[PDB]
Symmetry: C6
Subunit: 61 residues, 6 copies
RNA sequence: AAC
């Protein structure tokens, strides 16, 4: 986690808009509210739990 | 841990949820219960949903 | 484990169940048996279905 | 419970040389006989032996 | 472990890489860094790619 | 156990192989090395292939 | 939701 956690934490603390690309090709957008070992809590109009196993890539918007 | 308190608040307050599967299909219902690998999603009857097949869970 | 009760119930009742796979395939039959990683589904054939390929199990 | 079902099911097919179909999650159907398997792979023989990863397999069924 | 040397070699020599994903998508850039589960890919932006989503890593 | 002897015989004997990915793509070359998680495949270029993305390995 |  020596790279993943710092990467997600900096986006979380700064409240950067991010794009989360899922394996099926769908792109989600919002702010990272928090995360744990298996999930990311992504907030836009509502708070959704995204399973990391479904994510291909995370990048600031 | 963020997963379990998130699913518990939906379970206890019997909140209606959308579960999106990795193929894009949206399922809807109430979280009857969950464990390490599955979620039981009730409408009239419960179906068993494998977490490995879920991309997102969001209220309503 | 919620899987065992959920699946043992179906297995004993021999009721029809739909198994939806992660690729969108819908299988229809009876739950004949299961273990940690597979489910044996019975219709005109008995086929061994890997749980990793399953999204949902839905009583008919 | 563990491998109670999987391992006898595959062992029966192997022992009796039953022609099998293995459906991959991508939809592709493989056919042949199961010559052996371990924790992660199944060896399938048609004209030649190919190693199939269980992680890619959805269903196994007699042809 | 073959991953570390392979990926580090590509990091040290600044090699432009293609990261193919399991779903057909190609990402292109340089390996900025990596850990057990992710690879950081730098092109115009720095993106974090989950290894579970990657099929292959190759020079462009 | 079956996997390691299978792959080692292809590596040691430098046998041309075909590696099919879960999206159906066929890669070709020789296996230089492999570990728990990856296979290094040599053709014109050396590429790393994640085992989780492979469906089938067969001599070509 | 590809009986």
């Amino acid at each position: 986690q020596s790279l993943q956690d710092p990467f997600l934490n900096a986006l979380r603390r700064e409240r950067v808009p991010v794009s989360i690309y899922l394996v099926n090709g769908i792109k989600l957008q919002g702010q990272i509210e928090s995360f744990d070992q298996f999930v990311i809590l992504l907030k836009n109009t509502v708070s959704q739990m995204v399973y990391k196993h479904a994510i291909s890539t995370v990048v600031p918007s």
